[PDB]
């Protein structure tokens, strides 16, 4: 199981937010921690992506781009899985030290987005997603959002995406395989709308950060002000199965 051996070997370990849970919840503190957690997670997402089979087949300029565009979606999918495996979807497990109950979902002003992520988390259980299906689907998510004007070398990207779909095919393997593929691709598509709502929220917050006492880390601020608007303005779009 060469491919799956690799995906398991490179899967990131636990990442903490550094949040002060021994203090009353406040919008400012909760979002400052979400931003810090995001910066911390981005570091791991980059190291993970660069270690994926065939990733070096991509043009160097397309490598960071694909990571930046897919970052939110990758985080959402992984968080949903952690929430399912750790707390049976009872709460959103952003990090061991940043678990969201409904009060925090409300305090964070990200309630609608959080409920959708809780639903995604429940889906992992309802569809009985296996750890191996999770790993392969998460990898495919990295190759699911591209620019309309094209990547430096679109062909290398198209080949890589096809190969990851083939690997998902193998993990699944007739009618039974078809039904499963339908379920998984539907689940994958469902991550994009959620990531979009989070992109919009992060963007709006960054623009008003100076007035809400929210602090934005260097790399995150860069992605949110440079890459995210490309997605929100329609220049960069997700690749839906359906
Ligand atoms: C508000 C902002 C940009 O900090 C943010 O969405 N942060 C953030 C941090 C971590 C995680 N995570 O999955 O570990 C997520 C999210 F993907 F759940 F939504 C968002």
Curated annotation (Swiss-Prot):
Effect of residue 104 to H: In AIS and PAIS; almost complete loss of androgen binding
Amino-acid positions noted as binding 17beta-hydroxy-5alpha-androstan-3-one in the UniProt annotation, renumbered to this chain: 35, 82, 202
Effect seen on changing residue 222 to A/Q: Reduced transcription activation in the presence of androgen
Mutation effect (residue 114 to Y): In AIS; loss of androgen binding and of transactivation
Mutation effect (residue 164 to C): In AIS; loss of androgen binding
Sites bearing Phosphotyrosine, chain numbering: 240
Region Interaction with LPXN, annotated ranges: 1-242
Effect listed in the UniProt record for changing residue 84 to L: In PAIS and prostate cancer
Result for mutant: residue 55 to L: In a patient with severe hypospadias
Record note on what altering residue 112 to N does: In prostate cancer; somatic mutation
Result of changing residue 180 to H: In AIS; strongly reduced transcription activation
Effect listed in the UniProt record for changing residue 227 to R: In prostate cancer
Post-translational changes noted in the entry: Ubiquitinated. Deubiquitinated by USP26. 'Lys-6' and 'Lys-27'-linked polyubiquitination by RNF6 modulates AR transcriptional activity and specificity.
Consequence when changing residue 222 to K/R: Loss of transcription activation in the presence of androgen
Cysteines engaged in disulfide bonds, as pairs: none
Outcome following mutation: residue 137 to V: In AIS; 25% androgen binding
Domain NR LBD, first and last residues per copy: 1-224
Effect on the protein of changing residue 78 to V: In prostate cancer
Effect seen on changing residue 71 to L: Strongly decreased transcription activation in the presence of androgen
Effect of residue 199 to Y: In prostate cancer; increases affinity for testosterone and androgen sensitivity; increased transcription activation
Family that this chain belongs to: Belongs to the nuclear hormone receptor family. NR3 subfamily.
Cited function: Steroid hormone receptors are ligand-activated transcription factors that regulate eukaryotic gene expression and affect cellular proliferation and differentiation in target tissues. Transcription factor activity is modulated by bound coactivator and corepressor proteins like ZBTB7A that recruits NCOR1 and NCOR2 to the androgen response elements/ARE on target genes, negatively regulating androgen receptor signaling and androgen-induced cell proliferation. Transcription activation is also down-regulated by NR0B2. Activated, but not phosphorylated, by HIPK3 and ZIPK/DAPK3.
Quaternary structure (record): Binds DNA as a homodimer. Part of a ternary complex containing AR, EFCAB6/DJBP and PARK7. Interacts with HIPK3 and NR0B2 in the presence of androgen. The ligand binding domain interacts with KAT7/HBO1 in the presence of dihydrotestosterone. Interacts with EFCAB6/DJBP, PQBP1, RANBP9, RBAK, SPDEF, SRA1, TGFB1I1 and RREB1. Interacts with ZMIZ1/ZIMP10 and ZMIZ2/ZMIP7 which both enhance its transactivation activity. Interacts with SLC30A9 and RAD54L2/ARIP4. Interacts with MACROD1 (via macro domain).
Name the UniProt record assigns to this protein: Androgen receptor
Organism: Homo sapiens (Human)
Residue window of the full protein shown: 672 to 918 of 920
């Amino acid at each position: 199981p060469i491919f799956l051996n690799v995906l398991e070997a490179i899967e990131p370990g636990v990442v903490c937010a550094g949040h002060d849970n021994n203090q009353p919840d406040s919008f400012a503190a909760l979002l400052s921690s979400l931003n810090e957690l995001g910066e911390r997670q981005l570091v791991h997402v980059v190291k993970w992506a660069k270690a994926l089979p065939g990733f070096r087949n991509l043009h160097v300029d397309d490598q960071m781009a694909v990571i930046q565009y897919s970052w939110m979606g990758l985080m959402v999918f992984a968080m949903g899985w952690r929430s399912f495996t750790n707390v049976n979807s009872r709460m959103l497990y952003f990090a061991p030290d940043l678990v969201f109950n409904e009060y925090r979902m409300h305090k964070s002003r990200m309630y609608s987005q959080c409920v959708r992520m809780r639903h995604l988390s429940q889906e992992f259980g309802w569809l009985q997603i296996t750890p191996q299906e999770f790993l392969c689907m998460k990898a495919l998510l990295l190759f699911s959002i591209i620019p309309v004007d094209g990547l430096k070398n679109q062909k290398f990207f198209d080949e890589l995406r096809m190969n990851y779909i083939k690997e998902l095919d193998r993990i699944i393997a007739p009618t039974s395989c078809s039904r499963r593929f339908y379920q998984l691709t539907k689940l994958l598509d469902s991550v994009q709308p959620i990531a979009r709502e989070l992109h919009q929220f992060a963007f709006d917050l960054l623009i008003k950060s100076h007035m809400v006492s929210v602090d934005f880390p260097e790399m995150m601020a860069e992605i949110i002000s440079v890459q995210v608007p490309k997605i929100l303005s329609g220049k960069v779009k997700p690749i839906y199965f359906h």
